[PDB]
């Protein structure tokens, strides 16, 4: 339903994310179905990744990966009070997959740390 939360696309990153304010087989029958499958393929594209980082059911999950300053050497105040999610994404878009892999191993090892912890 309401997956269009773009309402704060021109606002600063910290102002938007941190503190909100029966078919018939014809060309509308197979069109409307592929549009229904194409939507949930992509909802599971991300909810699977959110599960691989220990972030299932979380909009703001903190991680265990320090910030490599080579990704972006910019201050908290010149990110969350100056940039917008649309343009920050573009600036950090190149390293987006390195962080994903690295998030994945931080959660996998965290899964076995609690495994050694609950063994006592």
């Amino acid at each position, epitope marked *: 339903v309401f997956l269009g939360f773009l309402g704060a696309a021109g606002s*600063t990153m*910290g*102002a938007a994310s941190n503190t909100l304010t029966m078919l018939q087989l014809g060309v509308w029958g197979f069109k409307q179905l592929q549009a229904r499958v194409l939507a949930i393929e992509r909802y599971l594209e991300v909810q699977q990744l959110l599960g691989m980082w220990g972030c299932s059911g979380k909009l703001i999950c903190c991680t265990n990966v320090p910030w490599n300053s080579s990704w972006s050497n910019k201050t908290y*105040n010149e990110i*969350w*009070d*100056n940039m917008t999610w*649309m343009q920050w994404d573009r600036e950090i878009g190149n390293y987006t997959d390195t962080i994903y892999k690295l998030l994945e191993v931080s959660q996998f090892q965290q899964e076995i740390n609690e495994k050694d912890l609950l063994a006592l």
Partner: nanobody, 128 residues
Framework: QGQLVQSGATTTKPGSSVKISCKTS????????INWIRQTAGRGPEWMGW????????????????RVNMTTDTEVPVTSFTSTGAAYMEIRNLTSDDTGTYFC????????????????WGQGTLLT
């Protein structure tokens, strides 16, 4: 980036009222306050006022409260994050004490506690 090119360095005599332009580029003109600051030769650098190119809200010093008219026309979109705006400012009962170079500067950020801070400055305009 961004560059604030100012008006020309034309001179007038007391009793008059001159307008100073400030044509911005390379940044979203609506996202940051425009700020004018005067450097009088016989005084300390005096902050005159910022206006909001988005909200249309102004704030001057009490020494220019009823003496300065600051305005901005709308911005021309160039791309997703580039615009071109123009900033205008006048002085009422003008004398020769107001002699000096006048600067225009855009704000620092668009949020937090240092929102309007004159970060990126212009070229200045010699008066006399």
């Amino acid at each position: 980036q961004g560059q604030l090119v100012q008006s020309g360095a034309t001179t007038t005599k007391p009793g008059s009222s001159v307008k100073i332009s400030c044509k911005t580029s390379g940044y979203r003109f609506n996202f940051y306050h425009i700020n004018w600051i005067r450097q009088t030769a016989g005084r300390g650098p005096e902050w005159m006022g910022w206006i909001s190119p988005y909200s249309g809200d102004k704030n001057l010093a009490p020494a220019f409260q009823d003496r300065v008219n600051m305005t901005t026309d709308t911005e021309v979109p160039v791309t997703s994050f580039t615009s071109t705006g123009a900033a205008y400012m006048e002085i009422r009962n003008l004398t020769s004490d107001d002699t000096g170079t006048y600067f225009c500067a855009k704000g620092l950020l668009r949020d937090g506690s240092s929102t309007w801070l004159p970060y990126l400055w212009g070229q200045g305009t010699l008066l006399t």
